[PDB]
UniProtKB/Swiss-Prot annotation, chains A, F:
Pfam families: Globin (PF00042)
Domain of life: Eukaryota
Classification of source organism: Eukaryota, Metazoa, Spiralia, Lophotrochozoa, Annelida
GO molecular function: heme binding; iron ion binding; oxygen binding; oxygen carrier activity
InterPro entries in the cross-refs: Globin, Globin-like_sf, Globin/Proto, Haemoglobin_extracell, Mb-like_M
Protein name: Extracellular globin-3
SUPFAM superfamilies, per database record: Globin-like
Swiss-Prot record, chains C, H, I:
UniProt keyword Heme present: yes
Highest taxon of the lineage: Eukaryota
Molecular function, one GO term: oxygen carrier activity
Transmembrane segments: none
Subunit (UniProt): The extracellular hemoglobin of the earthworm consists of 12 subunits that have a hexagonal bilayer structure with a molecular weight near 3.8 million. Each one-twelfth subunit is composed primarily of disulfide linked trimers (chains A, B, and C) and monomers (chain D).
Protein family per UniProt: Belongs to the globin family.
Sites where the protein binds heme b: H97
Location (main, coarse): secreted
Keyword entries, A-Z: Disulfide bond, Heme, Iron, Metal-binding, Oxygen transport, Secreted, Transport
Domain Globin: start-end pairs: 2-147
Organism annotation: Lumbricus terrestris (Common earthworm)
Compartmental location: Secreted
Name this protein carries in UniProt: Extracellular globin-4
UniProtKB/Swiss-Prot annotation, chain E:
KW Manganese (keyword) present: no
Subunit structure: The extracellular hemoglobin of the earthworm consists of 12 subunits that have a hexagonal bilayer structure with a molecular weight near 3.8 million. Each one-twelfth subunit is composed primarily of disulfide linked trimers (chains A, B, and C) and monomers (chain D).
Alphabetical list of SUPFAM superfamilies matching this protein: Globin-like
Disulfide bonds: C4-C133
Domain Globin: 3-145
GO CC entries: extracellular region; hemoglobin complex
Organism per entry: Lumbricus terrestris (Common earthworm)
Keywords for this protein: Disulfide bond, Heme, Iron, Metal-binding, Oxygen transport, Transport
Name of the protein this chain belongs to: Extracellular globin-2
Source superkingdom: Eukaryota
Family matches, as PROSITE patterns: GLOBIN
GO function terms (MF aspect): heme binding; iron ion binding; oxygen binding; oxygen carrier activity
Positions contributing to heme b binding: H96
Length: 149, 140, 147, 60, 145, 149, 140, 147, 147, 140
């Protein structure tokens, strides 16, 4: 209810997250942004580089990774776009939990960090950003995704 | 250099500010007026394009041509291979001819002043200064 | 003759679909695709752009060029509502091509055909005729001194 | 009498910022409900009311 | 039929942008599509027994649907550039290979998408183009062969 | 041609031509303007001076000519004001043709010039002028008026 | 002198720009403010009409009286016999007193700047410069 | 007396019908026609304007004068919405007439009658009373000073 | 936890009832009444304000203080819509209290209770919970710096 | 000092002009921008609060803190015992640091210029000048 992620709250997030996909070259953006986001993660926590090894994170611009950049960044999209349908969003995220559960090496502390990074990044590409609303929602998402251990 | 974001930011804001059709001529005009009132020394080289009467079609045309080029550079800007090329291309159209160095520093001053009005408080001065500057030096 | 106002409006819109985002990527591929059609039909013209390094398609020295061309067209269209200014820059645009030794009145009629063959493929709802009409009025005057 | 009155109803349905969307279709009626114009006449029922299936006649 | 190409891609990629939309339009867009699919081949409901395929309106399935379109998004959106698309398709290829899914269903699902998209875009929509691309995307998932 | 002097075209012309008659002293304007228009014609082509001899063109400010200045300038008004009724406008102009046919000395080249003059003059009194629309309509008019020689 | 059209153009534009009732005081005020900020030396002779506080009614009155005269001269222009007379009449009211000639060159600078804003791009700078100038010299 | 805001509005309109022509011709003939009525009734006053050459009606030295008078009236009316300023310029307008040796309190009451006889002829829908009321308030303050 | 947007709106209003008048008078009595409750509960803190002369309640040297406190709070609330700036000034507000030797993390939790007991008396329709929530988020960040 | 009315007038107009919430930040920003463009020498002491980028949150915060104090003083002034105290309090926060005296004379110039725009012709320049001045001197 109050605790979790308000209608207005996400209605906001959703609106602000859309400022991004106004131009058809979403790929170039999603990639570049997701690329940077993951990079800046491996920067602060290297034990990550080995996890993303499978997707050739070594080559940031390498298609292998660029594709990945999308998948993840695009997953975040899914999460955000289902914010207005808790049961669905729930299911959608639970699924993401399982996709991370079987990937050993990935620990909670990783998400906590990725969250802080994401929160410092968004406001750099979006002129209109409501830190409070976002933090509220991103938390709920990141948590439910890593919930499965 | 610049940052990739620091560009996209400008590329984006330029869109809203500059505008389309007439909205532009208005921009160009407002810009040059402020510039010429501050430094009337410029009405000199703009003799070919009736710089005395900035409201004239002759100058109006010019005004637009200019802004357009600025659009290109800015649109070039993000992606280095095109910018490096575009900039080099602009340098040539200038080197041949005399212009003062400081004139551009002036042009920039106002271009920012104007975008300031158009965009408001959202205007990312930092991003523009760091970014449009690079465009001035190269041509310069 | 002079162009109908409705037609101008038609184009002022049709263009907003090809120009599109502020991105180079798109406009580039289109303007390029336009020239490729000019060269496949009037191969002679190709040589004219060695100055911008057409031998290096992805050069950037050339890509930038394409953009300038694109933007120059953009500037025209986006002037169709300010006649008097258009009429002047339209001249200025001629002079920039008259001093370019080797540019025929023909090559222009040729690039005109180019768009009329490309555009209808990059976007739907293209009023080929309307475009053709106002594009000719623009070209005519650009040549116009030159010959 | 029916049509004549129903006709009047229409004139009213036209006034105002509309319940349903331009795109969306207003089921009625007692209780409003908005469904897509694409959305009726799926063959699934949108409407409690059953509009998507009771309007017996194809205009065309 | 149509094997797909750069422009026809850009067109679908753009039109898809409009048809996909967001928020509720999405939750429905997907809904509509699945209803159209299942209506064609009721046989297929049995495959989604795991995610409440019996009731298309059940949250579990709503998620599933919204989740499926998600991939289709990546596909269409990626596809413009061959380098990346290649990868996404390949990725999908894997998540599918091993598992029998008849070409009969994919066909219906395509039809579904097409009909709904057409219903959503009103007038500006090239059928052939979509057909061609949805195809290329599906092929990349069946491995077809 | 066929295209041109479209509805929008003349709807424009009409609107712009009205900017002129906002003040009650239309006479002073029409005269001065028409006076100048004819003068500037005799300037570029003198064989005209003899044609307008009958109306004492020698005395520009002379009532004899001032009246004329109106008649003509006022005829142009009629033409413009009938732009939205082709059959009527047609008839109205055909009539003007005949009034010029029986006036020997008047040749086509005269109108072509008067047109160019008119096109350079209008934009001097009207702040809002659409050269394209006007040229399109003025052509149709001037032609039909002279078309009979 | 000026061209018969070059006048009508100003006579006309003056109408739209100047305006009626309050719309005018606003104009006058905006004008004098810009003038005094640029050259505070002027607050001197305007001592009689509280030039220190341009928002005051005392100055406001003045402001209006001025513009009014400007209106006369302008509507004077169109017919030469009246203008030539009116101008001569104004010259007298000035010659006696001493002024600095450059003040008027300033006044003109702004009057145009302001009309520029009011009228926009349609503003026929040429016509005004050529025409209002002729009104200033006469007075000086 | 006092006058009423509605009446001011009435006049602020009635005037827009006499003034209305842009430039001089009209306003001149009217203001003139007004004075001619002042002189036909208080011939004495005539002499007062030798400074502007009334002996030369079409002089221009005089026409310009008429205009100044007209415009001075215009300025008044166009101030009726800004009371405080009107009240001041209204004084200033008095002083400009007190220093004019020979101007009686009467001549004013006389020119007032003038308008009230002329205006109703140059335009229809003239609220003579409303005019009269606000004109008197204006005159009183102008005239009064001199004494 | 966090602050909802609705809650912000609630406060952005609740405040407009305490602040409202231009006058010091009101805000003073309130902020004072708040402190009086802080001192009646955590008397130790009293000493901390000898610098502003609390021994002279009506001093003015002290009244002004109260106002500064009030206004400092006002500034906070009136920043709730600009997060990023609030987050910074919120820090700056901490540092101004960390350098104030003797200010405990407790005294803050104490003044918090203060408002929650005062405000509900100076105005009706006070969402004590909503206030409490966002006030804590504000305090936490202020205080924390200190220890 | 002030007059009693001359204050209320300001106290009142300040209300309309300053505004609430965002409307303020906008005011502050517009103000400081005009100030810094006129005298870039000021970007110096504002080094602690990123004075180079006035659009930054760091400076934005500052901007607000400032205006707020101004609000206080303006509110203060009517009741003498509080003003005398408040003013004395401000003097201290200034005396210690070295500052330019003329800076404030500048600040005032603009604060009025801005309120001028915000309030329009109603703006009681007189009242403000007489009143805000008193606030500056005490500080300085």
């Amino acid at each position: 209810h109050e605790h979790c992620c308000s209608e207005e709250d996400h209605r906001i997030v959703q609106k602000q997250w859309d400022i991004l996909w106004r131009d058809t070259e979403s790929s170039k953006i999603k990639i570049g942004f997701g690329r940077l986001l993951l990079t800046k993660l491996a920067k602060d926590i290297p034990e990550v580089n080995d996890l993303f090894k499978r997707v050739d994170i070594e080559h940031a611009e390498g298609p292998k990774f660029s594709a990945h950049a999308l998948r993840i960044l695009n997953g975040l999209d899914l999460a955000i776009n289902l914010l207005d349908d808790p049961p669905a969003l729930d299911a959608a995220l639970d699924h993401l939990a399982h996709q991370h559960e079987v990937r050993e090496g990935v620990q909670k502390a990783h998400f906590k960090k990725f969250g802080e990074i994401l929160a410092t990044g968004l406001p750099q590409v979006l002129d209109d950003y409501d830190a409070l609303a976002w933090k509220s929602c991103l938390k709920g998402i990141l948590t439910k995704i890593s919930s499965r251990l | 250099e610049c940052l990739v974001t620091e560009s996209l930011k400008v590329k984006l804001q330029w869109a809203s500010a500059f505008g389309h059709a007439h909205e532009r001529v208005a921009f160009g005009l407002e810009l040059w007026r402020d510039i010429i009132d501050d430094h009337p020394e410029i009405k000199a080289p703009f003799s070919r394009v009736r710089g005395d009467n900035i409201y004239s079609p002759e100058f109006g045309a010019h005004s637009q041509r200019v802004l357009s080029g600025l659009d290109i550079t800015i649109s070039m800007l993000d992606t280095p291979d095109m910018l490096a090329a575009q900039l080099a291309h602009l340098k040539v159209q200038h080197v041949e001819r005399n212009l003062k160095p400081e004139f551009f520093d002036i042009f920039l001053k106002h271009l920012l002043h104007v975008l300031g009005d158009r965009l408001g408080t959202h205007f990312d001065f930092g991003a523009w200064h760091d970014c449009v500057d690079q465009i001035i030096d190269g041509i310069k | 003759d002079c162009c109908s106002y409705e037609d101008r409006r038609e184009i002022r819109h049709i263009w907003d679909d090809v120009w599109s985002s502020s991105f180079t990527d798109r406009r580039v591929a289109i303007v390029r695709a336009v020239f490729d059609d000019l060269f496949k039909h009037y191969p002679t013209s190709k040589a004219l752009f060695e100055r911008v390094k057409i031998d290096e398609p992805e050069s950037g020295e050339f890509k930038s060029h394409l953009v300038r061309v694109a933007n120059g067209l953009k500037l025209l269209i986006n002037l169709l509502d300010d006649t008097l200014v258009l009429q002047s820059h339209l001249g200025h645009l001629a002079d920039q091509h008259i001093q370019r030794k080797g540019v025929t009145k023909e090559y222009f009629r040729g690039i005109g055909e180019a768009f009329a063959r490309v555009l209808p493929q990059v976007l739907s709802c293209f009023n080929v005729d309307a475009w053709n009409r106002c594009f000719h009025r623009l070209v005519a005057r650009i040549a116009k001194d030159l010959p | 009498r029916i049509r004549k009155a129903g006709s009047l109803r229409h004139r009213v349905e036209e006034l105002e910022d509309p319940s349903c969307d331009e795109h969306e279709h207003q089921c009625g009626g007692d209780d409003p409900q908005c469904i897509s114009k694409l959305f009726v006449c799926d063959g699934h029922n949108d409407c409690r009311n059953g509009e998507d299936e009771k309007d017996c006649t194809l205009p065309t | 039929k149509k094997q797909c190409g750069v422009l026809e891609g850009l067109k679908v990629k753009s039109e898809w942008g409009r048809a996909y939309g967001s928020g509720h339009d999405r939750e429905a867009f997907s809904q509509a599509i699945w209803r159209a699919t299942f209506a064609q081949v009721p046989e297929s409901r049995s495959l989604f027994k795991r995610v409440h395929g019996d009731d298309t309106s059940h949250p579990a399935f709503i998620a599933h649907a919204d989740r499926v379109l998600g991939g289709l998004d990546i596909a269409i959106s990626t596809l413009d550039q061959p380098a990346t698309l290649k990868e996404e398709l390949d990725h999908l290829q894997v998540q599918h290979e091993g598992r029998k899914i008849p070409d009969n269903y994919f066909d219906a699902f395509k039809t579904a998408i097409l009909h709904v998209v057409a219903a959503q875009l009103g007038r500006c929509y090239d059928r052939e183009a979509w057909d061609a691309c949805i195809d290329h995307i599906e092929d990349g998932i069946k491995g077809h062969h």
